Structures are given as structure tokens and as C-alpha cells.
Amino acid sequence: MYLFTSEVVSAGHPDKCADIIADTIVDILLKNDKNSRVASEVFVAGNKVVIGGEVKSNHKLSKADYDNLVKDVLKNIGYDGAGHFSKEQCLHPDEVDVMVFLNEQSPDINQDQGIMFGFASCEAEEYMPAAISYARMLCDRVYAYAKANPHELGVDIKTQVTIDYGTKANFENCKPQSIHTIVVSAPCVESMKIEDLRSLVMKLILDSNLPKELFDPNKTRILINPTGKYVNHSSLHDSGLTGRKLIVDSFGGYSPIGGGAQSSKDYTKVDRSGLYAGRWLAKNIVAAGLAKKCIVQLSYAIGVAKPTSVSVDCMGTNTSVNDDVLSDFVMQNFSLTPNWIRDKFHLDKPSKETFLYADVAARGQVGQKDYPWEKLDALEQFKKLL
Amino acid sequence: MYLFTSEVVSAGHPDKCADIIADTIVDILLKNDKNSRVASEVFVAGNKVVIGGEVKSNHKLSKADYDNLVKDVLKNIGYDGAGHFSKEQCLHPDEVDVMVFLNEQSGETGAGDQGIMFGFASCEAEEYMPAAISYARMLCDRVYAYAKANPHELGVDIKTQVTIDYGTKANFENCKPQSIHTIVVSAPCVESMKIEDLRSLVMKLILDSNLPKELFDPNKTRILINPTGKYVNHSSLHDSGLTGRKLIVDSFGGYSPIGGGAQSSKDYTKVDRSGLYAGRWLAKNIVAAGLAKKCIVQLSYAIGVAKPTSVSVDCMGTNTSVNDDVLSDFVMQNFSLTPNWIRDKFHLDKPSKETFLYADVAARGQVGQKDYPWEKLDALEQFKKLLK
Numbered sequence A: 001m002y003l004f005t006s007e008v009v010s011a012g013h014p015d016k017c018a019d020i021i022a023d024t025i026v027d028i029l030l031k032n033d034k035n036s037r038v039a040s041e042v043f044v045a046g047n048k049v050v051i052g053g054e055v056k057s058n059h060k061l062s063k064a065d066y067d068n069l070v071k072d073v074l075k076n077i078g079y080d081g082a083g084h085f086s087k088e089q090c091l092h093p094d095e096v097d098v099m100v101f102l103n104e105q106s107p108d109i110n111q112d113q114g115i116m117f118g119f120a121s122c123e124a125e126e127y128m129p130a131a132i133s134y135a136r137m138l139c140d141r142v143y144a145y146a147k148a149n150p151h152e153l154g155v156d157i158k159t160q161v162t163i164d165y166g167t168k169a170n171f172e173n174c175k176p177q178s179i180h181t182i183v184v185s186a187p188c189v190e191s192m193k194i195e196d197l198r199s200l201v202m203k204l205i206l207d208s209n210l211p212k213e214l215f216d217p218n219k220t221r222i223l224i225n226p227t228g229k230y231v232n233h234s235s236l237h238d239s240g241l242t243g244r245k246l247i248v249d250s251f252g253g254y255s256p257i258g259g260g261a262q263s264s265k266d267y268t269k270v271d272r273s274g275l276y277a278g279r280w281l282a283k284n285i286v287a288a289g290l291a292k293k294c295i296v297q298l299s300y301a302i303g304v305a306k307p308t309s310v311s312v313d314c315m316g317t318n319t320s321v322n323d324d325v326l327s328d329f330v331m332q333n334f335s336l337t338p339n340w341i342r343d344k345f346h347l348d349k350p351s352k353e354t355f356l357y358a359d360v361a362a363r364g365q366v367g368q369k370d371y372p373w374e375k376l377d378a379l380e381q382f383k384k385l386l
Numbered sequence B: 001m002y003l004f005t006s007e008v009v010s011a012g013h014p015d016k017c018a019d020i021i022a023d024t025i026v027d028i029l030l031k032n033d034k035n036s037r038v039a040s041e042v043f044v045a046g047n048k049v050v051i052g053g054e055v056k057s058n059h060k061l062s063k064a065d066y067d068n069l070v071k072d073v074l075k076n077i078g079y080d081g082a083g084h085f086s087k088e089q090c091l092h093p094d095e096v097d098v099m100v101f102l103n104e105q106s107g108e109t110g111a112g113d114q115g116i117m118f119g120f121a122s123c124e125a126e127e128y129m130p131a132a133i134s135y136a137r138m139l140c141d142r143v144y145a146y147a148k149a150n151p152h153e154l155g156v157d158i159k160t161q162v163t164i165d166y167g168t169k170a171n172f173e174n175c176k177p178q179s180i181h182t183i184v185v186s187a188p189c190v191e192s193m194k195i196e197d198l199r200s201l202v203m204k205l206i207l208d209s210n211l212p213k214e215l216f217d218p219n220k221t222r223i224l225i226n227p228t229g230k231y232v233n234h235s236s237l238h239d240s241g242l243t244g245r246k247l248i249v250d251s252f253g254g255y256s257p258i259g260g261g262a263q264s265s266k267d268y269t270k271v272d273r274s275g276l277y278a279g280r281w282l283a284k285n286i287v288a289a290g291l292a293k294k295c296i297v298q299l300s301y302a303i304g305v306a307k308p309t310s311v312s313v314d315c316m317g318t319n320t321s322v323n324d325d326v327l328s329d330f331v332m333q334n335f336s337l338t339p340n341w342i343r344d345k346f347h348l349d350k351p352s353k354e355t356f357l358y359a360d361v362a363a364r365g366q367v368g369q370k371d372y373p374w375e376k377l378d379a380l381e382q383f384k385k386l387l388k
Helices: A014-032 A063-077 A130-148 A168-172 A194-206 A270-287 A323-333 A338-345 A357-363 A379-383 B014-032 B063-077 B131-149 B169-173 B195-207 B271-288 B324-334 B339-346 B358-364 B380-384
Strands: A003-009 A037-045 A048-056 A097-100 A103-105 A114-121 A158-164 A178-185 A221-224 A293-300 A309-313 B003-009 B037-045 B048-056 B097-103 B115-122 B159-165 B179-186 B222-225 B294-301 B310-314
Touching: A003 A130, A003 B115, A003 B294, A003 B310, A014 A037, A014 A048, A014 A063, A014 A357, A037 B037, A037 B048, A048 B037, A048 B048, A063 A097, A114 A270, A114 B003, A130 A158, A130 A178, A130 A194, A168 B324, A178 A194, A194 A221, A270 A293, A270 A309, A270 A338, A270 A379, A293 B003, A309 A323, B003 B131, B014 B037, B014 B048, B014 B063, B014 B358, B048 B063, B063 B097, B115 B271, B131 B159, B131 B179, B131 B195, B179 B195, B195 B222, B271 B294, B271 B310, B271 B339, B271 B380, B310 B324
Parallel strands: A048 A097, A048 A103, A178 A221, B048 B097, B179 B222
Antiparallel strands: A003 A158, A037 A048, A114 A293, A158 A178, A293 A309, B003 B159, B037 B048, B115 B294, B159 B179, B294 B310
């Protein structure tokens, strides 16, 4: 036995509410001024939504703009005030007060040493590692049910998956053996007994399309609302703050991590651009067949736009070329300057027909087929290495 | 030819002010009621401090008490309104408005939440820490100390970055740094101080720090002091801060994965805090015993379950003897790892000046200090039995 675990939380989780609100602001500003510099932090303290930070933009937001945006975000997440949950059980949009400390300033005239990582692996869907992939599948399925059935389930949902790899050697070779344990936490209406809640999410677990080679219900340990009573949920009972789900939003502990949060920020911060470029490179490398998994590490220096270096680590799973040759290829064939990355993924141009930052905030920064930094448009260039 | 960089910020950084305020609340509640349950998050911006989250304690805290706590914390961090910086340039205690938007909450004792946590250790630097963050930390501590004693010159919102050259990937994997490639220090100074003088001052502090001579040569290492030039404005007055937004700086500086869960704001029943301390303690004892050059320990929990749902160790290929399967089994079989076991192992419910204080840990980093109970090598002999 050799175990590894990852977690995911839904868009209804308080920290995600804060992330989705913050990146709704980013989207609005960028839609109207592409060169907006945004650092918009959100603290959902119960029924108090506190928006702070700083924005340099030509687009300005009124108090009503903030009120509308918060209510529309909460509604789309699932906090629509239908009243299946009492307003003391669950956040009700009417009870919210929005408090704005956000500082607006004019754009600067003509508007770091560090590292960022990306990662990819062949273990599971969209080249993501196993534990977080399967935790995401379960969460997505329970959240989707809760939205369709607010009379039964609430939208503040967490999941956790433990994978048994058997031996460390299988972990190194990307060879998961079984899903060992599944944890699901989902709130339900006051009138639903715990036995009936467990029966429901058990059905949802089986309908989450988990691979049968890994998942046997009879041999898997399943823990559903283990404390036995979970009705009260949302930011009312657990504070939410922006940038507090770094690992559920990325690689679930399978990769080292540097820098800081994506949400709250525009594309000019390497916390965004470096993660997206790093992930894009890693995904295309594994998708090309050069490795079973790899970690891509961008390094930046003061006074250079181009990264001082980019290093590829295939963690011993190389098929064709060693890590030195691969790193050299990457540095020589991709500029990877902030502006090149911006233009490569169109990061200054979020739109409903491409990607939205509020959408990525809700679904994960990495690991969804439709994002631009998840496109396999470098595959032909990498295939030249074999 | 193989670069790596970590960064540290001082207690004067807005995110750290938030962390330290939050953990000052944890300290006073636990001091007077050891079963207090605390999730007191903090947001700081401009002249505002907002406290939210949940608290359950027999020690009652008034609005005046919260106000006074906030001002006292800010004063001890170094924002004391002495007048070297104006109330427009950095935070003055007498100008802050405090809002308190707190609610109520909602081994045999089950874990307080699900989640994952990682401990890490490495034989590279003091106290089994990796090099770049160790040296970054050393420099930041030194500059912050100087600033607190000379507030007529420097502000206390400080940042340091250290870039290590390893030479090659192989050396990085075997914990062999070759040189410090770059040192970056950023500090505010008072309006009257010329940039040249700020730089002269900081240069001395770097040169007289205890950096190893093996790695540091002041004629080969590039030293950058205030890359964007002079600035006077600093503190949360000018950039917002939030609890739990320095998780990498407070731990392993890029050399390890993290769980994602924060430490500051929380009592010891939150496994996001306690599981980091237990992971780190295991990883440190494993490396100090000579079983690996570096080690990552993963723990996970499920809400309402006491025993961890998973325990795994990863020595990143650096094992000297036993493999990672045997190590993971040994840990599982010899250390209970329930919340109560962790609480009792490190006496987390009994903070004190002579042991540890949460607010002090917030300001000094969550790991890497000799005096923390989870930095003690008291499992050393147990792990040395695996050497054969």
C-alpha cells in the first residue's frame, strides 16, 4: 500500500465565492480597459461582503455596480434565496451588505526574482494527476445535482480522494492501482434524514463516471458527512477569503508550488502567467509522449522580460530525450516573455466565447479542456523530438 | 546553470500584519480557555482592520478589547505612529477603524475538517531547512531588526529574495548548493533619506550577516537593494493584506508542495495547522536520522474521523537505507497522528512564552525555528533504528 490524497471544493465553498467575486471584477475591468491593473481582494464575512485592494483603470465602478455583481455571482453559484434553507442556515442575497474599500487610481504613465511551476501527468483526464482528477469529477457531479435540486442539497460541497498506488515505484511510474477512499461533504435540508442523504450521494458517486478499473464500491472506503449532520453552510458559518484555495485550484499536492494566488489578479502578475505557461508546456510535453509526467519551472530575474531559465523535470519518466535537451528545446522555441504569454493565450481579452476569469475561478485554474493554456497547439513542435 | 529562488517578507508586510493580528486573538483566547475554537480571519486595508470568522470561547472579548488588541499588535510590529513616517505614508495606530463581524462556530475526537498537509525537511541549511528560504529569512530578520531600532531611517515592511545556484539538477536533488547567485532586499525609507544612503546602510547589514562564506562572495554575488528605487509609502495603508496569503513564505519557499490550508487564525483543532506541524516534525526527524537527504510527508484527514485517512512519505529518491513504502508504514504504525495525539505531542493547547506563542510563530515563520515543539528531534532514536 502507498497512498496519495487530493481535495476539491465546489463553487459554493466560501473561499471560492470570494475568488469568483474577485475575478468577476477583474473580468469587468479588463472587458472595458485591457491594460487595467487589478488587485481586488474579497472577504465574505458571513453576510458582509468586503471588497478591498487597488485598481488602476480607465473603467470605474459605482456602488450599484458592486451590489449587482455580488448578487449576480451569488445567484449563479446557487445562493439565490429560494428559502429551502433558512437565512440563518445559508446565505440569502437579500441579507448581504457589500462594503467597498477598494482604492481606485488612474493608470500609470505608459500602462521579480522568483519561480513558478506547471505540471501534467498521463494518469487521468486532461492530463491531470489521479487523486485531484477524481475528486473534481465527484465534486462537479454533486454540485450539478445540488443546483438542479435545491430542495434536497446545498451547494457548499467538498470532496477528497485517496489513491492507492500499491508501491512508491508505481507512484513514480504513474500507475494508480485503486481508489482507496472517498470523502464527500454535502449539506442537505433540515428535513432530510442522514440515511437518505448518504443514499443520494452514493448514487451520485456511482454516476460520476469513475473508471471501473480503479473504483469498486464494495472495496472502497466511503465517508459521507461523517459527523452525521450538516445543514448549516456558506460564508455564514465559515468565513471566505480570496486566494485561499491554491492547491485545489492547481495540482492537488502532486507538484511543488511557488508564488501566490491567481484570483484577485490581472494577467500581468506571474502568479497567473507563469502557472498558465508552465501548465501549457507540461501538458504538450506529456501529450506529445516525451514523458509520463513532468514539472515545468520558469525562473525570472530583475531587469529581463524573458525568463532567465526554464527547466523541465520529467521525474525519471523520460521516453526520448533527457531533461537537459528538453529544457534547452523549450527555452529556444518559446519566447515566454510576459507579453508573448499574454498574446499566446489572449489573457488581456477575456470573453464568453474564449474564457472568463470568473469561470476559471469557479472550475480550477488548470485541467479543463476549453482554456487556452490547455490547448495542445505545440504538439507538432514537440513531436520533432520524438 | 541551475537557479532556485525563495522570498521572505517581514512582520510589517500587510499579509503578515493580518496573520499576526489573527494569531494574537488565538493566543489570548487559548491562554484563558484552552478548549477555545477559533477561526478569526483578518483583512487589513487603508486605515481599516476587519475581523471576521467564527469564535467559541469562555473568555469573552469586548469591542474595546479587539480595538486595543489591534493597536497593540500594530505598535509591537513597528507601526506606532512615532512620526518618522506620516499618517499618509504608513499606518498610524490612532487612525485605524476596527470592524468586528464575528459569528458563532455553527485520539477519540474526530478531525475538525477534511484536508491534506505536507511537511518537508532538507539537510541543506540550519535546522534541516532548504537553503534559499533559510538565507532569505536570515536577511529579512536582520533588516527588520535594524528597522525596528532605527525607525527614523527605515520602515518595517521589508522583502528579501535569495537566488541559489546549484550548478546542476543533480546537485539540487542531493542538496548541494554551489553559490548564492543573487540577493535582493527591498525596504522603505523616510522622505529625507537619499537612495544612495539607504543602499549603503542595507549593504552593511547584508555584509555583516551570518551568510556562509562557502556560498557568499560579495564580489561574485549580485546584490540588488531597492530595484525600483526609493519609496516612502508602505504598510497595509497602501496594499491590502489578508490572513493565509503567505503560506509558501511561512513554510518551504517553493521547495515543497503545500496542503493549501492556512495556519494563522486557527486553533490547534484545525488540522490545516496541526497537520503541518506533525508532517514537518516527522520529515525533520527522518532527515536528521540520516534516512534521506530531503523528505516530504503527506497527511490527510476526513471530518469526524480521528486517525488520518492517509499517511505517506516521499524521500525524492534520496533514501540511504529503507524505501518509502517501509518508511510510510513505520510512520503509520508508530505515531497515532490523531488530532489529540498531535495536541498532546506538542502541547498545542498550552501556548506560553517558555514554549511557543501563536503570534510569535506567525511573525517568525511556521517552521524552521529551534524552539518550536514541532522542531524537536525527540523521535531521532526511533528513526535511527531503520538505518540498518
